[PDB]
Amino acid sequence: MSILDIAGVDDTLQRLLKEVWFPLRGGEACEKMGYRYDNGVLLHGPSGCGKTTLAHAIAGSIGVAFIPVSAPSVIGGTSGESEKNIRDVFDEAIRLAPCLIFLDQIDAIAGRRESANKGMESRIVAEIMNGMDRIRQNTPLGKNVVVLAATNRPEFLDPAIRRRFSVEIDMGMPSERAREQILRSLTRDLINFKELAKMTPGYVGSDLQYVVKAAVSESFQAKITMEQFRKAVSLVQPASTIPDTTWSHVGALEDVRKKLEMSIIGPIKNPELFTRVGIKPAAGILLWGPPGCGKTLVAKAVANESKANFISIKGPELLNKYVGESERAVRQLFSRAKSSAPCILFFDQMDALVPRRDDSLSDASARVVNTLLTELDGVGDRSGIYVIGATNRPDMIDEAIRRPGRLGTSIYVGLPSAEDRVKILKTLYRNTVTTDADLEKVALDLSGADLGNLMQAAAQACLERVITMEDWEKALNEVK
Amino acid sequence: MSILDIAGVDDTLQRLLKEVWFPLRGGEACEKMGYRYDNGVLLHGPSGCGKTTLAHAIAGSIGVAFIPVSAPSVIGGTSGESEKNIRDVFDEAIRLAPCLIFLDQIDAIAGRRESANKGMESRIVAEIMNGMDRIRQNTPLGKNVVVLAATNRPEFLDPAIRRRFSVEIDMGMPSERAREQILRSLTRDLSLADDINFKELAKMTPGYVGSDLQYVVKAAVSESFQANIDSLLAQARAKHPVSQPQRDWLLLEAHRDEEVSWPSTKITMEQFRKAVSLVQPASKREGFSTIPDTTWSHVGALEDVRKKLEMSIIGPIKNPELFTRVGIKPAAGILLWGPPGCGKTLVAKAVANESKANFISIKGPELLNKYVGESERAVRQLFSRAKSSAPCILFFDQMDALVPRRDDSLSDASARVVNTLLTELDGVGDRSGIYVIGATNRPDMIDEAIRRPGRLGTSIYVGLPSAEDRVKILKTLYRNTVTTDADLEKVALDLRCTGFSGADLGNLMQAAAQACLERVYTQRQQEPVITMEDWEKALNEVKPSVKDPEKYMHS
Amino acid sequence: WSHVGALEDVRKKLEMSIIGPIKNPELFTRVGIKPAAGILLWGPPGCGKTLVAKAVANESKANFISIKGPELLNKYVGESERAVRQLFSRAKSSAPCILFFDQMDALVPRRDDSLSDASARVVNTLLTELDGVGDRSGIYVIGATNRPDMIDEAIRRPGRLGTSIYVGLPSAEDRVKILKTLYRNTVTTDADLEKVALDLRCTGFSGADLGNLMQAAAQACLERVYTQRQQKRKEGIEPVITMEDWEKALNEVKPSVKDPEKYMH
Amino acid sequence: LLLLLLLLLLLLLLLLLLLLLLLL
């Protein structure tokens, strides 16, 4: 199936009212003015976005002859078999007018005839073109035929086939409101869905169905409670990942946290509060500090509180040796972040990725900078993508990279000098369960990542020999 | 369907009067001189350009025996079945002379037998060659057979078959004069309001083909029927005291079998303009960017830059006839340069939006590829789309990474990309209707052959705003997100804003708004609006981003 | 040739080398001139290399194939050299034919160790097609480039591209002929055009700069029309480029070839 | 019964060589 079974496509459901419902059901008006309203609609978008279900739901809501056709179902073995299967589909609809043809997975048979040199494949495309023209020409005025089609990659279709679809509908990734509607459409016949909607960024309609099934399945291992969905959400992953690092996992770093609570964390939890005061978020924040101070850890904490996905880049990992491949890798990060909104893009060791465009910088090192300059222009604002830099050489980055609207604001992550070391070590030990005074003298002995490695290395000596204070002095002479 | 159903092609109908009509309806004249006037005509062009409708319009007009053949319908299962279907078509035409054969989409079966290597495919090609020779030798000198063929890919035809068509007719994309005639023929059996001006409709559909203009008429018809649907939904809501679109489907489903009559309406010119925006032409399905939402109200000051862009790009696009009389080619090349953050992309997204033309934006070295010839092919394909959808605006953002100067150490993968753009911008092929905008911070790194008249001859400098210029920018930024106007002048004219670009002023406003939230929180734990004291907080914590303006002022 | 002003020396060389033998090959055969020419047009940008090669393609009334730089390159191993071989097959079958390679330095780069192996096969393919075992009689080749030194030295030899014609910046007297040609093909008289073209502000102007100078004069005319039209319509015309409009263009347009000796070598 | 000669399809799937480009 019914209309209720498909949700979050309010724009699609209203556009198709005048394009699918009217030509079929409202064919009496067309005959009065003598106008053949034979329409063709193409539905495209990411996989598992309710394209198949939408066609079937609309099929039953109109009450006309529905012909469900899948592209592999028409391909034959002999020469004339494949073309006659498609030819029969369009001939039947004319005799069954008004009718609603649905060609699911149309890209399988309607691919480009340029690359496809096979004789049968070229004739398949020419058979669909002839079929759609017969509908436009060989139907009564009062009876119109509407052709529906679905494809994951509309660009794979032949341009001659694609032009015959007057309407293209992009059923893209669901938003927070859409995912909230989707959850309310599957669990209606069985809870704060806003928390569920915001905790699942990048999920599709099919992914949200597994979560509903997981919660139902988990409710039968013992009515579904809210806490069951939280456990079920982590069980099913979308077909990147929200970090599990909270600020409790981070020691000290209060001044750094305060800035991020207004630059990034702020205009995510309360977008309207920052919208009223005109706080348009920039592309992101440049974190500069000595290595081993948890700059990667801080970014993971920001994504966890903001409930946004996290993507990390190690810097020179993107530098390919081919011409357009080093820049394509950068352009692919922002393409995935767009589909995973909200998301945080983290660039570790960004000094070697985008140096200053000096008068002597070759050309390959300058195309990567110009790739980021044109990519940071579609970051932040009203996109959900946030970019966090990370470098111990903040003065080796190009000026255009650090202008306002780009990674302009600089935040210094301080090195643990006296009391930060104590706070870090206590936090690390809280996850591996001595008291706390023993944990102080270990960290008070005369960076930040050293303590994390020291704790686990000191735990190796305990296994060789329960963790005791006397096992830390031996590990202080072998961990640097 | 009839001759009226095909419009916008007057040269084609003029040629076909002596190449299709005369051989068929002038059989007596041919017999008197003893000449076998058997002709073969091949129609080709972009898809949707009325090739199939032209053939059937001529077929019903001439009134001779017509044999419409679709190429895939010939193919059979057994060995000789496929070739005998072709042989039956030509033998039937000879028996029915005078006759007109229409081979629709002949490239499906007449592909190059060299590359398309098989056993049936080669015999299909050889059967059409044999068939097209019998018609011009077995007809009895008084009745002629004309073969009409249509294909989107004339280059895929076998040369032995393509050479057998004495006439090739190219039906390209319609012009403004042709698009108006197509709309009149499409809107001929419909009821229209007298306010409709087809000249306006023709000029607002740059890259539209005959099929696209059909969708505009199709969308306009449904637009006029919306009033009879919303009123019908109101009737359904009168019986039943889930979102808004879902209610409409269920209410109409709950009735379904109910029969209602739609009162006749007239399509309004306002509805036509709405239909044009809804319809995306087939030429813009791939490769084109969305028109930016930036307008001239988003750009503060830059009056000198705005005047140059209005005269060079916006002017000739909107008034091509006025600029043609003085002798100005309908093509401009503009290079925007200056220190970062001064409004180059902003002023280029406003021209693209305020000119109502098509827009393609290139993001630096986006067209580069690792394969040989693929980087150059993308550039050549870029100007093909921009030419078929003329007028079009090509924006090369951060262009210095796409056209570096061809020194003695520029390698050859990147030097071939420059030479491709040199020929595309100013070569042998025409590029009229294409307006090119380049934005860069390093104009000295661009090849000098690119920066010459005919390619990018006009260079506009967008530098740091002056003291009085920052006043206009700050007011423009503030009014787009909502202090008063007197304090904005004081803040903008403060000497702590010296060297501030347009991005720094946006950062100043963002920093001043953050101070408001800090002020609000302090005034909450013991209606947020930016106050004058908030501005002074941001006047100390914000420094200019362009630390060395001389690095960009000298280029 | 009515679109090409000045360049009398270049026009005479192209008529004796291409247009001559095409129209009356009988006369050139008696003296012993093969029906095949290779021309390399080179010089600073905007000085008329492509323009003069489009007049030859039009005045000779022969078949024409134009190549846009590295247009023949293909990603597959043999498909870029096959395109070159197929290019000379069509030209030979439809002789006389004129092959024009615009921006040719991107198709025949000088063969060095640092040169790509895939781009060195295209150079060697053109070496055999231009002058090898098979004959290319009836094929006339024109090349236009700004960097003649980046072309392989084997390509620039008699039998492949025998003659190099330098198309440089116009002189003061030549700029008068070019400006009149541009003006009369787009519509002030001729006495004012001589003053505009001979002005010291037009020093170093190429053929593209004179065309840009005329465009800047037309835009100044439209600005003058715009302001005067409002005054004489609200309070109370014909767009024609006047001598006062030429003054605004002269103070606005700057030369584009900033280093003429970079290309003159 | 009569034995008939029928036309069929094939898989083929040839593999093609490619040319790449490198940086300085």
Ligand SMILES: Nc1ncnc2c1ncn2[C@@H]1O[C@H](COP(=O)(O)OP(=O)(O)OP(=O)(O)O)[C@@H](O)[C@H]1O
């Ligand atoms: N917006 C949505 N509202 C409700 N259910 C949805 C929505 N999107 C997807 N679903 C459900 O998730 C599943 C998606 O499967 P479906 O076949 O409809 O996907 P699709 O878009 O056709 O993609 P694919 O062809 O790759 O499977 C179905 O069970 C469908 O009910």
Ligand SMILES: Nc1ncnc2c1ncn2[C@@H]1O[C@H](COP(=O)(O)OP(=O)(O)OP(=O)(O)O)[C@@H](O)[C@H]1O
């Ligand atoms: N000049 C024209 N006058 C009137 N209608 C036109 C014209 N050109 C196209 N159309 C309309 O647009 C559609 C064109 O479809 P048609 O089958 O004629 O295209 P085609 O040129 O054969 O292309 P293809 O090779 O893709 O089939 C039809 O609905 C036709 O009515």
Ligand SMILES: Nc1ncnc2c1ncn2[C@@H]1O[C@H](COP(=O)(O)OP(=O)(O)OP(=O)(O)O)[C@@H](O)[C@H]1O
């Ligand atoms: N003249 C201006 N009027 C209004 N806003 C401006 C102006 N100049 C800059 N801005 C603001 O600052 C931003 C600067 O970004 P823009 O893309 O325009 O810079 P740019 O000149 O392209 O420099 P870059 O080389 O760094 O991209 C604009 O998007 C706008 O928010």
Ligand SMILES: Nc1ncnc2c1ncn2[C@@H]1O[C@H](COP(=O)(O)OP(=O)(O)OP(=O)(O)O)[C@@H](O)[C@H]1O
């Ligand atoms: N001698 C000339 N006579 C008349 N007009 C000329 C002359 N030289 C140049 N022009 C004008 O200026 C334009 C310059 O373009 P042209 O293609 O001739 O340049 P080019 O010499 O090929 O340089 P590039 O190497 O940059 O391509 C011509 O199209 C024509 O409008």
Ligand SMILES: Nc1ncnc2c1ncn2[C@@H]1O[C@H](COP(=O)(O)OP(=O)(O)O)[C@@H](O)[C@H]1O
């Ligand atoms: N302030 C801190 N609080 C808690 N843990 C920290 C702190 N600083 C460093 N660490 C530990 O040190 C490690 C540093 O990892 P990472 O941030 O990826 O490298 P870097 O610090 O060099 O960026 C983390 O695993 C983290 O547990």
Ligand SMILES: [Mg+2]
């Ligand atoms: Mg599906």
Ligand SMILES: [Mg+2]
């Ligand atoms: Mg057709």
Ligand SMILES: [Mg+2]
């Ligand atoms: Mg910019």
Ligand SMILES: [Mg+2]
């Ligand atoms: Mg040229």
